[PDB]
Amino acid sequence: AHWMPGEPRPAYLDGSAPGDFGFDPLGLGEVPANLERYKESELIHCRWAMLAVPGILVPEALGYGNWVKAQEWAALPGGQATYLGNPVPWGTLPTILAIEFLAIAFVEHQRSMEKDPEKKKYPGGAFDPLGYSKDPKKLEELKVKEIKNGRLALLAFVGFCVQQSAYPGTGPLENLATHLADPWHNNIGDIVIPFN
Amino acid sequence: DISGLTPCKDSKQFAKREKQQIKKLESSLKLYAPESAPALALNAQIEKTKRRFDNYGKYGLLCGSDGLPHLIVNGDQRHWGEFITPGILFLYIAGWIGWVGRSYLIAISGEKKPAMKEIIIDVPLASRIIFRGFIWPVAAYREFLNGDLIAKD
Amino acid sequence: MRDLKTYLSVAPVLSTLWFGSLAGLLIEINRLFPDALTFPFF
Amino acid sequence: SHSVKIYDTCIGCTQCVRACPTDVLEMIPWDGCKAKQIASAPRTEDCVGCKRCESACPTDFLSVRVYLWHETTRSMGLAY
Amino acid sequence: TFNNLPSIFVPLVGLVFPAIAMASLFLHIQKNK
Amino acid sequence: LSPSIVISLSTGLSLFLGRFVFFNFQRENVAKQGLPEQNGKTHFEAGDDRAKEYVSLLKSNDPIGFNIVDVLAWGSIGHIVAYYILATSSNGYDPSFFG
Amino acid sequence: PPIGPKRGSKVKILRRESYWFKNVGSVVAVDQDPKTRYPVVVRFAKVNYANISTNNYALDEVEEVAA
Amino acid sequence: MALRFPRFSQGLAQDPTTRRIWFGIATAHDFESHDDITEERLYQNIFASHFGQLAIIFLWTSGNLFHVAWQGNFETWVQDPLHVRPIAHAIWDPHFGQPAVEAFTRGGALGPVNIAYSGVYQWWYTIGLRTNEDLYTGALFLLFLSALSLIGGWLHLQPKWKPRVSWFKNAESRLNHHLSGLFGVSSLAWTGHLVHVAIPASRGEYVRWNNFLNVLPHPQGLGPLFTGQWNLYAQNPDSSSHLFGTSQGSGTAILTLLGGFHPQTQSLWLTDMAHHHLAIAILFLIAGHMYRTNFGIGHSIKDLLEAHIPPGGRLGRGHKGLYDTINNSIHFQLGLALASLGVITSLVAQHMYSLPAYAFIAQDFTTQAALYTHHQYIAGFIMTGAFAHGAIFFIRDYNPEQNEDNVLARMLDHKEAIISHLSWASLFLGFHTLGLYVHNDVMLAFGTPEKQILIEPIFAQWIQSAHGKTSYGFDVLLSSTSGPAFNAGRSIWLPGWLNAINENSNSLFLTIGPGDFLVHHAIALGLHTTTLILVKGALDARGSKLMPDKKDFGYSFPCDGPGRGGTCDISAWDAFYLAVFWMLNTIGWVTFYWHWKHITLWQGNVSQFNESSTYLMGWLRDYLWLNSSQLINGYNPFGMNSLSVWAWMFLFGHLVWATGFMFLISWRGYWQELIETLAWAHERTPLANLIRWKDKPVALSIVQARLVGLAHFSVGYIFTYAAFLIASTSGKFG
Ligand code: CLA
Ligand code: CLA
Ligand code: CLA
Numbered sequence A: 001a002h003w004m005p006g007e008p009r010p011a012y013l014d015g016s017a018p019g020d021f022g023f024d025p026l027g028l029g030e031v032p033a034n035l036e037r038y039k040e041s042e043l044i045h046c047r048w049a050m051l052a053v054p055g056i057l058v059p060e061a062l063g064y065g066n067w068v069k070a071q072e073w074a075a076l077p078g079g080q081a082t083y084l085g086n087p088v089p090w091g092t093l094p095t096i097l098a099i100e101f102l103a104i105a106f107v108e109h110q111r112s113m114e115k116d117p118e119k120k121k122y123p124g125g126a127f128d129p130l131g132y133s134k135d136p137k138k139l140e141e142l143k144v145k146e147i148k149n150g151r152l153a154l155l156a157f158v159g160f161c162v163q164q165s166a167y168p169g170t171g172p173l174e175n176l177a178t179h180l181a182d183p184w185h186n187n188i189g190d191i192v193i194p195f196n
Numbered sequence B: 001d002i003s004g005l006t007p008c009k010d011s012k013q014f015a016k017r018e019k020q021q022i023k024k025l026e027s028s029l030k031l032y033a034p035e036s037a038p039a040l041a042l043n044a045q046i047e048k049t050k051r052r053f054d055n056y057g058k059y060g061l062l063c064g065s066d067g068l069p070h071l072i073v074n075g076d077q078r079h080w081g082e083f084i085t086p087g088i089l090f091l092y093i094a095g096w097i098g099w100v101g102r103s104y105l106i107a108i109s110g111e112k113k114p115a116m117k118e119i120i121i122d123v124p125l126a127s128r129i130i131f132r133g134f135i136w137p138v139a140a141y142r143e144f145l146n147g148d149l150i151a152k153d
Numbered sequence C: 001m002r003d004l005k006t007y008l009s010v011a012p013v014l015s016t017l018w019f020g021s022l023a024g025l026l027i028e029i030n031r032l033f034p035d036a037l038t039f040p041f042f
Numbered sequence D: 001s002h003s004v005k006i007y008d009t010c011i012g013c014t015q016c017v018r019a020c021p022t023d024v025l026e027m028i029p030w031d032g033c034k035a036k037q038i039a040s041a042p043r044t045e046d047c048v049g050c051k052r053c054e055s056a057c058p059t060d061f062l063s064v065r066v067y068l069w070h071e072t073t074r075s076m077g078l079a080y
Numbered sequence E: 001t002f003n004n005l006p007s008i009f010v011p012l013v014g015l016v017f018p019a020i021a022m023a024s025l026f027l028h029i030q031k032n033k
Numbered sequence F: 001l002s003p004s005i006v007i008s009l010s011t012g013l014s015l016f017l018g019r020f021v022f023f024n025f026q027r028e029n030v031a032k033q034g035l036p037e038q039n040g041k042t043h044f045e046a047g048d049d050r051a052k053e054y055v056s057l058l059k060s061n062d063p064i065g066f067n068i069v070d071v072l073a074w075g076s077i078g079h080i081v082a083y084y085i086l087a088t089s090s091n092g093y094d095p096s097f098f099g
Numbered sequence G: 001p002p003i004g005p006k007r008g009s010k011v012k013i014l015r016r017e018s019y020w021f022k023n024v025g026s027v028v029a030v031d032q033d034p035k036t037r038y039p040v041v042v043r044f045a046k047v048n049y050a051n052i053s054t055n056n057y058a059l060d061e062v063e064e065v066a067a
Numbered sequence H: 001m002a003l004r005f006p007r008f009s010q011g012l013a014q015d016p017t018t019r020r021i022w023f024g025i026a027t028a029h030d031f032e033s034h035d036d037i038t039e040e041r042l043y044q045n046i047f048a049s050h051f052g053q054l055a056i057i058f059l060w061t062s063g064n065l066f067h068v069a070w071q072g073n074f075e076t077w078v079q080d081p082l083h084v085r086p087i088a089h090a091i092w093d094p095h096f097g098q099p100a101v102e103a104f105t106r107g108g109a110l111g112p113v114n115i116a117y118s119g120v121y122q123w124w125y126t127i128g129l130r131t132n133e134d135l136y137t138g139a140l141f142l143l144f145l146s147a148l149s150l151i152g153g154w155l156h157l158q159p160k161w162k163p164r165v166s167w168f169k170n171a172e173s174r175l176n177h178h179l180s181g182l183f184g185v186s187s188l189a190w191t192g193h194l195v196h197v198a199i200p201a202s203r204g205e206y207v208r209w210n211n212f213l214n215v216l217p218h219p220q221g222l223g224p225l226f227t228g229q230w231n232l233y234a235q236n237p238d239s240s241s242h243l244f245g246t247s248q249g250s251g252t253a254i255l256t257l258l259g260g261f262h263p264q265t266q267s268l269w270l271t272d273m274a275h276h277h278l279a280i281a282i283l284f285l286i287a288g289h290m291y292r293t294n295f296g297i298g299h300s301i302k303d304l305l306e307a308h309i310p311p312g313g314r315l316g317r318g319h320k321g322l323y324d325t326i327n328n329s330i331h332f333q334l335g336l337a338l339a340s341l342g343v344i345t346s347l348v349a350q351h352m353y354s355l356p357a358y359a360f361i362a363q364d365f366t367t368q369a370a371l372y373t374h375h376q377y378i379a380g381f382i383m384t385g386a387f388a389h390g391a392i393f394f395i396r397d398y399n400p401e402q403n404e405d406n407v408l409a410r411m412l413d414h415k416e417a418i419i420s421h422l423s424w425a426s427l428f429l430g431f432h433t434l435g436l437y438v439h440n441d442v443m444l445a446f447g448t449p450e451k452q453i454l455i456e457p458i459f460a461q462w463i464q465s466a467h468g469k470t471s472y473g474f475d476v477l478l479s480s481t482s483g484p485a486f487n488a489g490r491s492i493w494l495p496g497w498l499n500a501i502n503e504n505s506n507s508l509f510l511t512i513g514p515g516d517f518l519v520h521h522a523i524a525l526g527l528h529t530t531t532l533i534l535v536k537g538a539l540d541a542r543g544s545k546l547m548p549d550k551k552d553f554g555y556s557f558p559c560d561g562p563g564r565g566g567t568c569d570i571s572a573w574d575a576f577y578l579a580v581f582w583m584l585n586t587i588g589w590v591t592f593y594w595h596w597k598h599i600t601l602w603q604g605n606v607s608q609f610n611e612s613s614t615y616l617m618g619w620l621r622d623y624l625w626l627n628s629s630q631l632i633n634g635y636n637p638f639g640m641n642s643l644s645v646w647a648w649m650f651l652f653g654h655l656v657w658a659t660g661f662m663f664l665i666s667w668r669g670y671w672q673e674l675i676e677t678l679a680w681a682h683e684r685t686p687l688a689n690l691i692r693w694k695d696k697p698v699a700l701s702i703v704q705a706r707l708v709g710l711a712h713f714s715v716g717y718i719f720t721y722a723a724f725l726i727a728s729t730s731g732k733f734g
């Protein structure tokens, strides 16, 4: 377990934590309270991004959008979201912002008030149906799996955002389609090396 | 054509400046005999002027409304030769000097009275140290990595 | 010559020799490559 | 008038007194140095402020120390 | 008499008030309680 | 939506967040900062006989401790967000991004 | 026992008000009297602004350098 | 307390010499150093002095208003503004000769008068204030406010209302009130003026105190505001044809965000400024309710500073303990205050010329030059004072044991790095700026201007092209139509802003060139070097290797004697004093650049500046020698003209700028040994032994004479350049 074999491990990164492959070049997690805050925020970023990747790929495969087309309707005054074709009757810009704020603020601020640093990241109980917590010998494996898939989804979200930045008006499945059609001449190389 | 500047081989004001300076030299050339030495020096200056303007034409210099070569120092490759290719050629040479005079100061730092080598330069030691700064950038790089570049007080 | 090389090693004599050589170098370069404003040799 | 305070870093070299053109300073007995003497300053009211005392003090910074203060006719170097 | 008012006040502030202030402040400068 | 509805809904949803959601965070941050300390002592403790924290205005009854000053605060945020909504909606402005 | 450094020991200075602050020096001599407040005479390679290369320093205004 | 005139100091009162007089004048407002002083009495004297300053400010503004109301042609100026000269005040000089009365009669006046180059005409005309009775009423009201401030300053010195030391140290309630009320309610009230008065005044009708409760600033009236339909206040923007002062082409809107200039006045829209002051009023009223005062909510600035300690300790202890080194230290407060004030004064100068707010203030050219020069020299002085008071804080008020390892002690931990890298930046800038200027001087000298090093300012032209200036072809965020910036603002303000900035005749984002690059780097040299001197004096205020006990000698002291090589000008005061020279040089550069760029724009030949600003004989010939002809011809042997006073003031400023050199070059010791001979001669001259001084006539003190030389120097600098910049800009007026 090491992000780069041959590099020395930080003394505070032993490998016991889930996904602790010793990757701290800049030295951010040197004090332990910041490291617990960073673990909580890593898992939060991870869970949001890996929930987001289906919400980006699926509505582009079948939902008739491309994950930014789902936002353009709010940029134009007059027009509401096309949740699978049908328009939503819950208003367009301001009231969805009200519901989003009033819902996620309550959820995330009931998350904030937790003091146990393990429940701050792995609460369980109501958030653990199906009883996938009653055996730590596999729960550690599942925590490593969560961390790994979540870091993968975070990198995939960088892929989404930067493929949107390089190609302004497309989506990731269109990028994969272009790479499956002509894989050599339609890759990143035309952007890292701009011809003009 | 960056920064709203026509190139100097195409700028009419640049050619007008050339013709004005050439006429200013020719009006001073009439007062001398065509075979005399002042006249030949003026003619050499005339050819120097003409090929100077031709060279500012061919080297991609950009001329403004005033009709003078402006330097685009931003980073455009077309004009690296205006600032960056000289600039590196400065930072090399300058960094030669400082890497020499520093190294010399480290080589006469361990003397008994090291101040009588500041005012009386050891030419053998200085000549040994001078070419050490030829490939100075790798020495400075490694001394930065080895910590020998910064004294530890 | 002993103690003449120490005098010629002194900072002003050595500075005038170095800057005379250097100034002649720059002067002959500007004779060879007059009126330079770019480095086109790459 | 002025305030010529001295400090215990004095080594008893007697050079500030020998520089003083107004007899502000005077060596006294002391036990804090190899020379077993230190430079007092009783006649501070006669101090002009010329700081010859501290232009002759061979310490790391200074032992005798002139702090310019209320200027009287004796401290303004006035013969009138 | 309103074009005559500058002629009243420019001396009264510029000659008279400066004499008043200079005298009074010179007395205040040299006073001793 | 009529402006009275907008003002009432946004104010209600602001002091609802203040009464129930963002109460313990605001109050614990208040206790954390505590008081303005002039040289260790507070402004009133050091003197000045005018910076006394008023308690006749903060003593109001509530099982959780809501006071009239929080009613003004959550409610100033309320009217502010409401008027932001109202003016932003009443201004027929086209952002027209990318087109 | 002789107090302080030795008559050739290298030393550095922790006196804030000195010219040679955080600069090394050579201990000339240490006065063994336990009544002189500044016994450690130090010699420095470079002069101060008063063209003086030495001053007496205290024991706690000095630090025996490990070089 | 004491006996003689410096009652506040019994050390100068017990001084037989003339130094008593001078030093009692100088140290009069240094309440921190007086006898029998307490922090309470210091704060109370400061408060009463602030009241006195506010009283003098309102009195000076009342004087402006009275002398424009009595002796001004303001009623005639509001008819044809851009072709009628303002009148500052009349002139009754009994030394004037009849030609000088014939010459100084301007503006259609009954006698000789002075031309208001201050812009009070334009500003007053823009905010309403049409007839002279309005200016009379304003002067009466500001006399009333002067008396009110005097009353307050006397009242808050009596024991029944003397505020306590812990009341001036309430650094949360004061910020709360000043942000909310002094900054927010005042901007709100200025919006109230611009809406009830200045916009109706620009659109004809004269809404005054008698008829402002029964006229509607907007035809609906508080329906839009209360109902939230605020767009109704931006309905009729009096588009593109409005004649200022008349109802032709007028509108009904009061807060429309249009951007850009009026077409007629070439100033900003009063609706724009109304909406502006309203917006910042909301922002300042919001920002006020931040600091906890009495009510159980808000922040404590302590636990914001104490809490901003970064983990990892890159700063150290952070701001732990910085509330106490500012709340208890008035010199830190004053340094920060003057820093912000100098920054925003420079901002005032830099925005009032490029975004002129007043009607027909861009059309009178001498006014803009006088205003920019004024506010920039004021800003440079205020900045120099910010730093001087930081040095005085480091000496008098800084407690290192209270702020160990915090973000402020870390300055002194590595002050050598700051000072040496400022000494690198300034040295680089000067070496290269001067090298390029001298290269171009020599190229123009050798008749080869094509060999000049004309480095285009691509990085400022790119910013201009990021604002809509289509003069460089960079096609950036607001010069490119296909962009997010030219889409989210193309419907609100970018029309007017683009049509204003693209106009080559106004001062908004002037077309720059290589001379602008070179002079901007001269400006950077000036700022970096003044900063170097001031920062070096502030951080070496407590001590250095040459004088580690400097804190014990105070801020201003002459020297530390000739010993230790020589300690001339070692104080932090001396650093300030040298930095005033470098500051005046810096502002002279920025204002020479401004005035030549603008006089070439106003004349029409921008090509003159663009081809002549790259070499210094162009600045000496085509700016100083060329534009000073009509000035120095203010009085010739065969007559004089209206610029005679500016020629005389020009030479006067030269004379005192040279007299400062007497005190700066010639130092004491020569003068004491001269005045000793003079005292001998007076005591031995018959019929003058009768007369004898009471104060023994000593020469000027050393630090005093540095101050006096600096005062003569700066007075001459300022008067010379004021005379030249007004005479040249008023001899031709563009
Ligand atoms: C700091 C500001 C500054 C700058 C940037 C310049 C820049 C320049 N000036 Mg100006 N000048 C300045 C100040 C400045 N000057 C001042 C202050 C004066 C008055 C004293 C002048 C007076 C002046 C005159 C009168 C003239 C110039 C000229 C020039 C040009 C020099 C051409 C030349 O001979 O170099 C050629 C290059 C060299 C001499 C360097 C050679 C270095 C040696 C050979 C070592 C390099 C090789 C090395 C071993 C590395 C190789 C790599 C590897 C294989 C090892 C150049 C544009 C001349 C010109 O052409 O006008 C435009 C000219 O006629 N200048
Ligand atoms: C011999 C030279 C001389 C003298 C003495 C004067 C005298 C005067 N001129 Mg000037 N003038 C002169 C030559 C001279 N003129 C020349 C050659 C020209 C060019 C043609 C002019 C052009 C000119 C103009 C254009 C104007 C004057 C004005 C004035 C008057 C100023 C009003 C006044 O006293 O306010 C009081 C004076 C002051 C506030 C200035 C003094 C400032 C002091 C030094 C600074 C403060 C120091 C300190 C705080 C106080 C210490 C003193 C204390 C004891 C009171 C005054 C009569 C003005 C006038 O008449 O308007 C009313 C006016 O507008 N003159
Ligand atoms: C809301 C209530 C309130 C208000 C209005 C004020 C107002 C003021 N207080 Mg404060 N004060 C308050 C509450 C308040 N205070 C409380 C509660 C306390 C106790 C904690 C204090 C304690 C206190 C002290 C200790 C002092 C003051 C001072 C002052 C005065 C500041 C000096 C000045 O004129 O700045 C004017 C500055 C501005 C209006 C800011 C303008 C800056 C902008 C950004 C500039 C650019 C725009 C420009 C205005 C346009 C010009 C164009 C043209 C019109 C010229 C001012 C009268 C000082 C004073 O002068 O005492 C008399 C002083 O010493 N106050």
Ligand code: CLA
Binding pocket: H422, H423, H424, H426, H427, H428, H429, H430, H431, H434, H525, H529, H532, H533, H578, H579, H581, H582
């Ligand atoms: C024209 C006058 C002038 C000039 C050139 C300078 C130049 C300088 N001053 Mg300023 N200064 C001046 C007037 C001037 N000062 C005045 C009147 C005062 C009031 C007392 C001050 C007060 C002052 C202070 C208080 C400070 C400075 C600083 C500096 C340096 C700033 C860094 C810089 O630009 O260096 C770039 C170098 C130059 C501009 C030097 C120009 C000369 C050329 C480039 C050198 C080569 C010439 C030639 C080849 C030599 C041959 C001649 C000979 C051997 C035959 C620099 C040496 C600061 C400083 O030194 O710190 C860095 C500082 O702290 N000065």
Ligand SMILES: CC1=C(/C=C/C(C)=C/C=C/C(C)=C/C=C/C=C(C)/C=C/C=C(C)/C=C/C2=C(C)CCCC2(C)C)C(C)(C)CCC1
Binding pocket: H331, H332, H333, H334, H335, H336, H338, H339, H340, H343, H383, H386, H387, H388, H389, H390, H391, H393, H394, H535, H538
């Ligand atoms: C000595 C001292 C002192 C004094 C000092 C001083 C005087 C300082 C000054 C300072 C200054 C005088 C500063 C200034 C600064 C500035 C800055 C820092 C800026 C920034 C900016 C920015 C950040 C920007 C941004 C932007 C832009 C670019 C434009 C548009 C908009 C935006 C926002 C985007 C004190 C008392 C403190 C203390 C003690 C020491």
Ligand code: SF4
Binding pocket: D006, D009, D010, D011, D012, D013, D014, D015, D016, D017, D037, D038, D039, D056, D057, D058, D059, D063, D064
């Ligand atoms: S202060 Fe100077 S003169 Fe006096 S004893 Fe010390 S070293 Fe000698």
